[PDB]
Amino acid sequence: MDVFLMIRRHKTTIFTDAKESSTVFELKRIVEGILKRPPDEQRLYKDDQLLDDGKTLGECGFTSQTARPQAPATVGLAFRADDTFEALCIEPFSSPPELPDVMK
């Protein structure tokens, strides 16, 4: 099937799907589409570990099982500026309040 993803950099977060057989470069070519940056100036990570440009999404560990529409897998993103890639920073989302007392 397809893998469903969140591609996250600083406070931006992209919802996009892709094929398991489709590659990392092809995925960078999506991000280019959206954010208008060449695949050259992009690094993609799973967790905290950089992804080979040639390796397929399946090989990287993205399965239909691990990357569902309702529960998409997170790809990290870094951008070059000034001839060096920045460190991969992903702003966390807000926290929910503690569960109400009636909710327990």
Partner 1 sequence: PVLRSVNSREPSQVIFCNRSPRVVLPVWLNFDGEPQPYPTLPPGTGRRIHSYRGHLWLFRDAGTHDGLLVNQTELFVPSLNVDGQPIFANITLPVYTLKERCLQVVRSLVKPENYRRLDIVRSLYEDLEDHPNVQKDLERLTQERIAHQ
Partner 2 sequence: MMYVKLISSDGHEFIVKREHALTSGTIKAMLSGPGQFAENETNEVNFREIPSHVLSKVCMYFTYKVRYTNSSTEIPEFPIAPEIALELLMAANFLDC
Tokens for 35? 């954010």
Q: What is the number of other CB atoms lying within 10 angstroms of the CB of residue 38?
A: 11
Residue number with CB closer to partner 1 (36 or 104): 104
Tokens of 78: 């870094």
**Separation between Cα atoms, residue 45 and residue 66, nearest integer Å:** 16
Residue 50 CB-half CA count within 13 A? 11
Per DSSP, the three-state class of 58 is helix
Q: Please, what is the minimum distance in Å from the beta carbon of residue 87 to partner 1?
A: 35
Binding residues for partner 1, per CB under 8 A? 100, 102-104
Return the one option of partner 1, partner 2, none that residue 13 interacts with (CB less than 5 to 8 A, by type).
partner 2
Q: Which does 85 bind (CB under 5 to 8 A by kind): partner 1, partner 2, none?
A: none
Choose between 54 and 100: whose C-beta lies nearer to partner 1.
Answer: 100
Quick one: tokens of 14?
């992209």
Q: Is 26 in the site for partner 2 (CB under 8 A)?
A: no
Q: Is 97 in the site for partner 2 (CB under 8 A)?
A: yes
Query: Residues interacting with partner 2, by CB under 8 A?
Result: 4, 6, 11-17, 34, 68-72, 91, 93-100, 103
